[PDB]
Short mmCIF file of C-alpha atoms and ligand atoms in Angstrom, two decimals:
data_model
loop_
_atom_site.label_atom_id
_atom_site.label_comp_id
_atom_site.label_asym_id
_atom_site.label_seq_id
_atom_site.Cartn_x
_atom_site.Cartn_y
_atom_site.Cartn_z
CA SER S 1 102.65 123.30 141.67
CA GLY S 2 104.23 125.98 143.81
CA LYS S 3 101.63 128.64 142.67
CA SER S 4 99.68 131.11 144.66
CA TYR S 5 97.42 132.91 142.23
CA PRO S 6 96.50 136.53 143.01
CA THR S 7 92.92 137.77 143.61
CA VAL S 8 91.41 139.79 140.79
CA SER S 9 88.07 141.61 140.98
CA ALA S 10 84.77 140.23 139.74
CA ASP S 11 84.81 142.66 136.91
CA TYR S 12 88.26 141.43 135.82
CA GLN S 13 87.00 137.82 135.83
CA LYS S 14 84.04 138.86 133.75
CA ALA S 15 86.27 140.50 131.19
CA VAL S 16 88.51 137.35 130.95
CA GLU S 17 85.39 135.24 130.29
CA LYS S 18 84.19 137.53 127.53
CA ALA S 19 87.62 138.03 126.05
CA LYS S 20 87.92 134.22 125.79
CA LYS S 21 84.83 134.05 123.62
CA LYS S 22 85.79 137.07 121.45
CA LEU S 23 89.26 135.51 120.98
CA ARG S 24 87.83 132.16 119.88
CA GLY S 25 85.75 133.77 117.09
CA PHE S 26 88.45 136.10 116.01
CA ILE S 27 91.25 133.57 115.88
CA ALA S 28 89.14 130.96 114.12
CA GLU S 29 87.91 133.44 111.47
CA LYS S 30 91.38 134.93 110.72
CA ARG S 31 93.06 131.54 110.66
CA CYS S 32 95.90 132.85 112.89
CA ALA S 33 95.95 130.33 115.66
CA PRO S 34 99.58 129.20 114.97
CA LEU S 35 100.88 132.72 114.92
CA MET S 36 99.07 133.46 118.23
CA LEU S 37 100.43 130.35 119.89
CA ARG S 38 103.95 131.45 118.64
CA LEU S 39 103.26 134.93 120.21
CA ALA S 40 102.32 133.53 123.62
CA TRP S 41 105.27 131.10 123.61
CA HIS S 42 107.84 133.87 122.58
CA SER S 43 106.46 136.15 125.27
CA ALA S 44 106.70 133.32 128.09
CA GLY S 45 109.88 131.64 126.87
CA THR S 46 112.21 134.55 127.78
CA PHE S 47 111.95 133.64 131.50
CA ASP S 48 115.25 133.19 133.36
CA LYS S 49 114.63 131.44 136.78
CA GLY S 50 117.97 132.53 138.30
CA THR S 51 117.41 136.23 137.81
CA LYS S 52 113.43 136.13 137.70
CA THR S 53 113.62 138.27 134.56
CA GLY S 54 111.47 137.96 131.34
CA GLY S 55 108.60 135.73 131.01
CA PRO S 56 104.78 136.42 130.23
CA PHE S 57 104.46 139.98 131.34
CA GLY S 58 103.29 141.69 128.20
CA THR S 59 106.63 143.11 127.06
CA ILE S 60 106.51 141.43 123.54
CA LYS S 61 104.42 144.31 122.23
CA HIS S 62 107.20 146.74 122.75
CA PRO S 63 108.92 147.67 119.51
CA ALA S 64 112.39 146.83 121.07
CA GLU S 65 111.30 143.22 121.68
CA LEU S 66 109.33 142.84 118.39
CA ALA S 67 112.71 143.85 116.77
CA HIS S 68 114.45 140.74 118.13
CA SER S 69 115.18 138.43 114.96
CA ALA S 70 113.62 135.49 116.85
CA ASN S 71 110.37 137.63 116.79
CA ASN S 72 110.25 138.22 112.98
CA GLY S 73 106.55 138.24 112.01
CA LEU S 74 105.15 138.58 115.52
CA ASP S 75 104.34 142.37 114.87
CA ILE S 76 101.57 140.93 112.61
CA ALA S 77 100.03 139.11 115.73
CA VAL S 78 100.27 142.20 117.91
CA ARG S 79 98.65 144.29 115.41
CA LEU S 80 95.88 141.74 114.76
CA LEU S 81 94.97 141.64 118.52
CA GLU S 82 95.11 145.32 119.24
CA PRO S 83 91.48 146.12 118.23
CA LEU S 84 90.24 143.28 120.41
CA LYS S 85 92.40 144.19 123.27
CA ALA S 86 90.94 147.77 123.21
CA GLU S 87 87.56 146.18 123.89
CA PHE S 88 88.90 144.85 127.30
CA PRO S 89 90.75 147.74 128.77
CA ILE S 90 90.78 146.21 132.29
CA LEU S 91 92.88 143.21 131.21
CA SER S 92 96.65 143.29 131.27
CA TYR S 93 98.28 142.65 127.97
CA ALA S 94 100.19 139.86 129.66
CA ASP S 95 96.94 138.04 130.45
CA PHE S 96 95.42 138.77 127.16
CA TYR S 97 98.33 137.31 125.11
CA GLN S 98 98.46 134.25 127.40
CA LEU S 99 94.74 133.80 126.91
CA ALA S 100 95.17 134.14 123.17
CA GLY S 101 97.68 131.22 123.26
CA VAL S 102 95.27 129.06 125.27
CA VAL S 103 92.47 129.84 122.88
CA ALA S 104 94.69 129.02 119.94
CA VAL S 105 95.15 125.55 121.21
CA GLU S 106 91.49 125.12 121.91
CA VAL S 107 90.07 126.37 118.63
CA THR S 108 92.33 124.10 116.65
CA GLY S 109 91.05 121.11 118.59
CA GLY S 110 93.72 120.73 121.25
CA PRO S 111 93.53 120.28 125.07
CA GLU S 112 91.77 122.87 127.30
CA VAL S 113 94.77 124.47 129.14
CA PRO S 114 93.90 125.88 132.50
CA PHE S 115 94.19 129.62 132.73
CA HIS S 116 94.49 131.82 135.78
CA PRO S 117 94.38 135.65 135.51
CA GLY S 118 96.54 138.28 137.28
CA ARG S 119 99.78 138.82 135.44
CA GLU S 120 100.99 142.32 135.76
CA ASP S 121 102.51 144.16 132.68
CA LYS S 122 106.25 144.87 133.24
CA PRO S 123 107.99 147.91 131.98
CA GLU S 124 111.15 146.49 130.36
CA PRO S 125 111.70 143.80 127.85
CA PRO S 126 114.27 141.08 128.59
CA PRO S 127 117.61 140.97 126.69
CA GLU S 128 117.63 139.34 123.23
CA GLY S 129 118.90 135.78 122.72
CA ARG S 130 117.07 133.71 125.18
CA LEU S 131 114.70 131.89 122.69
CA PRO S 132 115.92 128.44 121.22
CA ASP S 133 117.96 128.24 118.04
CA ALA S 134 116.38 125.81 115.48
CA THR S 135 119.85 124.70 114.27
CA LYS S 136 121.07 123.37 117.55
CA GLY S 137 120.35 120.25 119.47
CA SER S 138 119.42 118.54 122.79
CA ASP S 139 122.19 120.25 124.91
CA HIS S 140 120.89 123.61 123.74
CA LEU S 141 117.27 122.53 124.42
CA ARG S 142 118.10 121.75 128.05
CA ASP S 143 120.06 125.01 128.44
CA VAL S 144 117.04 127.02 127.37
CA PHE S 145 114.01 125.07 128.72
CA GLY S 146 115.68 123.63 131.73
CA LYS S 147 118.56 125.86 132.95
CA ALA S 148 116.72 129.15 132.05
CA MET S 149 112.96 128.44 132.16
CA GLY S 150 113.01 125.71 134.73
CA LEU S 151 110.86 123.26 132.71
CA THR S 152 111.38 119.38 132.60
CA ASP S 153 112.53 117.09 129.75
CA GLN S 154 108.84 116.01 129.38
CA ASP S 155 107.79 119.63 128.96
CA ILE S 156 110.37 120.06 126.21
CA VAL S 157 109.06 117.16 124.16
CA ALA S 158 105.31 117.97 124.78
CA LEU S 159 105.78 121.71 123.96
CA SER S 160 107.70 120.84 120.79
CA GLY S 161 104.41 119.37 119.68
CA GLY S 162 103.15 122.96 119.31
CA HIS S 163 104.61 122.53 115.79
CA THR S 164 101.56 120.25 115.17
CA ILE S 165 99.88 123.45 113.94
CA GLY S 166 101.38 126.15 111.66
CA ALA S 167 104.42 126.55 109.41
CA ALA S 168 107.75 128.28 109.02
CA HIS S 169 108.14 131.16 106.60
CA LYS S 170 111.34 131.87 104.55
CA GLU S 171 110.89 135.67 105.19
CA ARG S 172 110.64 135.12 108.95
CA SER S 173 113.05 132.33 110.21
CA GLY S 174 114.20 131.17 106.69
CA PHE S 175 112.74 127.69 107.21
CA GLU S 176 109.63 127.02 105.11
CA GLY S 177 106.45 125.03 105.25
CA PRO S 178 104.20 123.16 107.62
CA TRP S 179 105.22 120.28 109.92
CA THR S 180 101.91 118.55 109.37
CA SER S 181 99.46 117.84 106.51
CA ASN S 182 96.71 119.73 108.59
CA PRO S 183 98.36 122.92 109.98
CA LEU S 184 95.23 124.23 111.55
CA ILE S 185 94.44 120.94 113.43
CA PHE S 186 96.14 120.26 116.78
CA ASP S 187 96.79 116.56 117.17
CA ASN S 188 99.73 114.11 117.68
CA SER S 189 100.74 114.23 113.92
CA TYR S 190 103.83 116.23 114.63
CA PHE S 191 105.24 113.09 116.38
CA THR S 192 103.83 110.62 113.74
CA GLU S 193 105.65 112.68 111.01
CA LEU S 194 108.89 112.94 113.05
CA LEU S 195 109.07 109.15 113.35
CA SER S 196 108.20 108.23 109.74
CA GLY S 197 110.95 110.32 108.23
CA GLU S 198 111.04 113.31 105.87
CA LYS S 199 107.95 113.48 103.59
CA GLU S 200 108.19 115.95 100.74
CA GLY S 201 106.21 119.10 101.50
CA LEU S 202 106.71 118.74 105.28
CA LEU S 203 109.23 120.50 107.56
CA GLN S 204 111.53 119.20 110.20
CA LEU S 205 113.90 121.46 111.94
CA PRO S 206 117.26 120.28 113.40
CA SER S 207 115.76 120.95 116.89
CA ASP S 208 112.80 118.64 116.01
CA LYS S 209 115.22 115.92 114.91
CA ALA S 210 117.21 116.22 118.11
CA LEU S 211 114.19 114.67 119.95
CA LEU S 212 114.62 111.43 118.00
CA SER S 213 118.24 110.79 119.03
CA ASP S 214 118.24 111.81 122.73
CA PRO S 215 117.75 108.92 125.22
CA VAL S 216 115.21 110.81 127.30
CA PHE S 217 113.34 112.60 124.57
CA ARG S 218 112.95 109.59 122.22
CA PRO S 219 110.72 107.50 124.56
CA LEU S 220 108.45 110.55 124.80
CA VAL S 221 108.24 111.05 121.17
CA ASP S 222 107.18 107.30 120.92
CA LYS S 223 104.56 107.62 123.58
CA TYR S 224 103.04 110.71 122.07
CA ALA S 225 102.92 109.15 118.63
CA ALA S 226 101.29 106.12 119.97
CA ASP S 227 98.82 107.84 122.43
CA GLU S 228 97.25 111.19 121.66
CA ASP S 229 95.61 111.31 125.00
CA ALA S 230 98.95 111.10 126.71
CA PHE S 231 100.31 113.88 124.43
CA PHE S 232 97.16 116.16 125.27
CA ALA S 233 97.64 115.58 129.00
CA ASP S 234 101.37 116.44 129.01
CA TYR S 235 100.87 119.31 126.50
CA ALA S 236 98.18 120.84 128.76
CA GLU S 237 100.50 120.58 131.87
CA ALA S 238 103.54 122.05 130.05
CA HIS S 239 101.62 124.94 128.37
CA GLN S 240 100.08 125.91 131.73
CA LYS S 241 103.62 125.94 133.32
CA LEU S 242 105.12 127.85 130.49
CA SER S 243 102.32 130.51 130.56
CA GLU S 244 102.90 130.97 134.29
CA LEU S 245 106.71 131.23 134.39
CA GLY S 246 107.60 133.91 137.02
CA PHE S 247 103.99 134.29 137.81
CA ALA S 248 102.22 133.47 141.10
CA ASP S 249 105.38 132.98 143.10
CA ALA S 250 107.31 130.91 140.65
C1 HEM L 1 111.89 123.50 120.88
C2 HEM L 1 112.47 124.74 120.47
C3 HEM L 1 111.89 125.47 119.30
C4 HEM L 1 112.40 125.83 118.25
C5 HEM L 1 113.85 125.74 117.80
C6 HEM L 1 111.33 126.52 117.50
C7 HEM L 1 111.64 127.19 116.30
C8 HEM L 1 110.63 127.66 115.40
C9 HEM L 1 110.84 128.20 114.04
C10 HEM L 1 112.07 128.45 113.44
C11 HEM L 1 109.55 128.49 113.58
C12 HEM L 1 109.08 129.24 112.21
C13 HEM L 1 109.00 130.66 112.32
C14 HEM L 1 108.57 131.22 110.95
O1 HEM L 1 109.55 131.10 110.05
O2 HEM L 1 107.50 131.59 110.71
C15 HEM L 1 108.59 128.21 114.63
C16 HEM L 1 107.21 128.32 114.32
C17 HEM L 1 106.23 127.87 115.27
N1 HEM L 1 106.51 127.58 116.60
FE1 HEM L 1 108.31 126.92 117.31
N2 HEM L 1 110.18 126.51 118.09
C18 HEM L 1 110.37 125.83 119.28
C19 HEM L 1 109.48 125.59 120.23
C20 HEM L 1 108.10 125.99 120.17
C21 HEM L 1 107.10 125.90 121.28
C22 HEM L 1 107.57 125.42 122.76
C23 HEM L 1 105.99 126.28 120.84
C24 HEM L 1 104.68 126.41 121.50
C25 HEM L 1 104.35 125.46 122.49
C26 HEM L 1 106.12 126.61 119.43
C27 HEM L 1 105.10 126.94 118.57
C28 HEM L 1 105.26 127.32 117.23
C29 HEM L 1 104.24 127.52 116.27
C30 HEM L 1 102.73 127.35 116.59
C31 HEM L 1 104.83 127.98 115.13
C32 HEM L 1 104.17 128.25 113.76
C33 HEM L 1 103.95 129.73 113.56
C34 HEM L 1 103.13 130.06 112.31
O3 HEM L 1 102.48 129.22 111.69
O4 HEM L 1 103.10 131.28 112.00
N3 HEM L 1 107.47 126.48 119.03
N4 HEM L 1 109.29 127.66 115.57
O1 ASC L 2 99.34 131.57 111.63
C1 ASC L 2 99.45 132.56 110.91
O2 ASC L 2 98.25 133.29 110.64
C2 ASC L 2 98.66 134.34 109.67
C3 ASC L 2 97.84 134.13 108.41
O3 ASC L 2 98.18 132.85 107.69
C4 ASC L 2 96.26 134.12 108.59
O4 ASC L 2 95.99 135.31 109.39
C5 ASC L 2 100.08 134.11 109.45
O5 ASC L 2 100.80 134.93 108.70
C6 ASC L 2 100.52 133.02 110.16
O6 ASC L 2 101.75 132.58 110.20
NA1 NA L 3 98.36 119.60 112.60
#
């Protein structure tokens, strides 16, 4: 909603289609889908709607932004993608990273998130400190996703389901381990695990737990745990919105 996507050339569109295929094979073989989803999300999640700064405009590869503590480990993702990006010189880095995030979800068995090309790479990274803090709660989540990014409460809960793939690392954030028993499979298990309590060997952040005690978030957790199709629909909507923050008159 509210989007007017730009025209790109036929050659640009051909490159998007071929890069999507190459990214599927690469991400599947390297087992790095979670890290790639995290890269796309940390690129997009810096958007501030009031100032129209930050967002998915390719700045995450700049050494200054990779140095943000919230981005520990993402230098690995940038390096992994560099040889592939060099095969598609016509594409913006902004588009390439967002495409990699869409592909990460698809190859782990998640929904097909719509993708529209045309993001232009911006020169300057946003200031540090916009991404969410795992030790904080619902008020903080609404400040970051709502007041800054302009996303809804439904989007907060569905996007938190990104933790259905991957793990934390004690050398990156300090937290450690996977949220689910199948960290390379995208399904509604994040919500099932959240509801059943703490199982040994699985992770829950304070920010995950905040979803269970908030009056608006909890019904959504319950719905997604009961209905994976509802989760997939809402996730696809929210990821598309995230990947387009500030893009295509926003
Ligand atoms: C809701 C607020 C959120 C907080 C506080 C948060 C925090 C974290 C933290 C602390 C980690 C572990 C980093 C590490 O040690 O390796 C992590 C990993 C991850 N996050 Fe989130 N995150 C949030 C939202 C999201 C969103 C919106 C997405 C994407 C839709 C996402 C996708 C991921 C993925 C896939 C990983 C695993 C990375 C890997 O396996 O290397 N997160 N997050
Ligand atoms: O998702 C990830 O992928 C890589 C590695 O496990 C496979 O390349 C990594 O360090 C992650 O956190
Ligand atoms: Na999983």
